[PDB]
């Protein structure tokens, strides 16, 4: 037999509208239509009737725009932060194929779509045909990006750190806030070097923090290891950093989204001595999605 | 513009720093095994020879005699106060002190050579450590000619 009906959604601007990609589990890359905060979502729900002769008794058809956060792969933990309904049909029958127009006016989409370890945040259209014991349901996923402009203030991070009477260094990264295709321009300056350093590297680290209060899991992922020095410096030695962020395709910083989760980035400077002892200093950076002109 | 050639500005390096000798020199050599005693209280001693230019060590050159128990004493002193996960020693060989083996026991040459290398392995990892250089036991061990356990 198969299914009695097949629900398809088609957006009015489905030719001209730009799509986007998302890295899911096991390296898969799904591509969905891109939307921005305040845009209207509108199109057609198309019901293809598959079994001619037969009839489809329903207690109503609707379409929902949904944006929700999912935690720990646990259906019971899902929280919808945006829900909009359009009733498409009263209780009735369907003998043949039909299509329904829908339009959600100027839809609020306060968060950027995210897929992480313990958190997903996704938007979708959910068409539902209500039936006596089991509803026919069709989801249609959308990416939403959240944009921003050049920040009012953007101070360079500059800091002396060390091990007392062994190693003193001053490091500097040119900004505190970097866009997703920006560049870490920085330097390391050696004030005192009484250890034998083999190499130094700059790492970019992604932390994903989930939960509330003492309920706090953190998932750390090291997105880049970038060697910046090879060999032992002396005092007065400057080491240039130029790390292009386009090569690692990171997400923006996301801070207390719906008071549920955060995702934050960190430049972890790591030196390593001849006996493989490892000295480090972590610094948060804000990543942000630049609005194209 | 075709290429991003951005760097932060740097302070030129002072010439005395650039060419003058580095401030991180530290080599320790465990060498020359010798049997001190006769009969039942025999033991091997090794010459622990230091060279350095770090200001935390009182002598830039020193040469002292040490026993495997002295290495065991040092590791026990650092394990208690220092909060440094201390590297292992080459091993207490009890079964080598047992009688009528097919080798010279604790004075076997392969054993002494392998012990000796493992002590140099140990002492260079411990003496290079930043937190271990602050402890008084390390300077007592390397640069005093006899250890004062009290």
């Amino acid at each position: 037999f198969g299914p009695i009906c097949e629900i398809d959604i088609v957006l009015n601007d489905g030719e001209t509208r730009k799509m986007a990609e998302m890295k899911t589990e096991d390296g898969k890359v799904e591509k969905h239509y891109l939307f921005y905060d305040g845009e209207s979502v509108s199109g057609k729900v198309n019901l293809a009737f598959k079994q001619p002769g037969k009839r489809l008794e329903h207690q109503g058809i609707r379409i929902e725009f949904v944006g929700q956060i999912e935690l720990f792969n646990d259906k019971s933990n899902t929280h919808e932060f945006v829900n909009l309904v359009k009733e498409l049909a009263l209780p009735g029958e369907l003998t043949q194929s039909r299509s329904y127009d829908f339009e959600f006016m100027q839809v609020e989409k306060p968060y950027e779509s995210y897929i992480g370890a313990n958190v997903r945040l996704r938007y979708f259209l959910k068409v539902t045909i209500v039936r006596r014991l089991t509803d026919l349901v069709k989801e249609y996923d959308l990416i939403v990006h959240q944009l921003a402009t050049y920040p009012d203030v953007n101070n360079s991070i500059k800091m002396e750190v060390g091990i007392e009477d062994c190693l003193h260094i001053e490091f500097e990264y040119n900004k505190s806030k970097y866009h997703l295709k920006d560049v870490i321009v920085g330097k390391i300056y050696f004030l005192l070097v009484r250890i034998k350093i083999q190499h130094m590297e700059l790492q970019l680290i992604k932390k994903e923090i989930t939960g509330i209060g003492p309920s706090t899991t953190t998932e750390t992922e090291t997105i880049a290891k970038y060697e910046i020095m090879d060999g032992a410096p002396v005092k007065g030695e400057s080491i240039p950093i130029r790390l292009f962020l386009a090569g690692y395709d990171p997400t923006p910083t996301m801070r207390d989204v719906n008071k549920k989760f955060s995702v934050r980035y960190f430049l972890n400077l790591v030196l390593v001595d001849e006996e493989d002892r490892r000295y480090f200093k972590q610094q948060e950076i804000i990543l942000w999605r630049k609005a194209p002109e | 513009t075709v290429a991003d050639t951005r760097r932060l500005i740097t302070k030129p390096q002072n010439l005395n720093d650039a060419y003058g000798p580095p401030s991180n020199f530290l080599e320790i050599d465990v060498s020359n095994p010798q049997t001190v005693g006769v009969g039942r209280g025999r033991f091997t001693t090794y010459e622990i020879r230091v060279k350095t230019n770090l200001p935390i060590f009182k002598l830039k050159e020193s040469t002292v005699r040490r026993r495997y128990s002295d290495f065991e004493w040092l590791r026990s002193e650092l394990e208690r106060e220092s909060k440094v996960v201390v590297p292992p020693l080459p091993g207490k060989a009890f079964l080598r002190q047992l009688p009528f083996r097919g080798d010279d026991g604790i004075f076997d040459d392969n054993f002494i050579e392998e012990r000796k290398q493992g002590l140099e392995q140990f002492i260079n990892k411990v003496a290079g450590h930043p937190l271990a250089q602050n402890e008084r036991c390390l300077h007592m061990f390397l640069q005093d000619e006899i250890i004062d356990k009290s």
């Binding site: 800091m159 060390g162 091990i163 260094i169 002892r277 490892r278 000295y279 480090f280 200093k281 | -």
Partner: peptide, 11 residues
């Protein structure tokens, strides 16, 4: 296994 040491902020 690998010895990590946080670099202290200097006065």
């Amino acid at each position: 296994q690998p010895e990590l040491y946080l670099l202290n902020t200097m006065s």
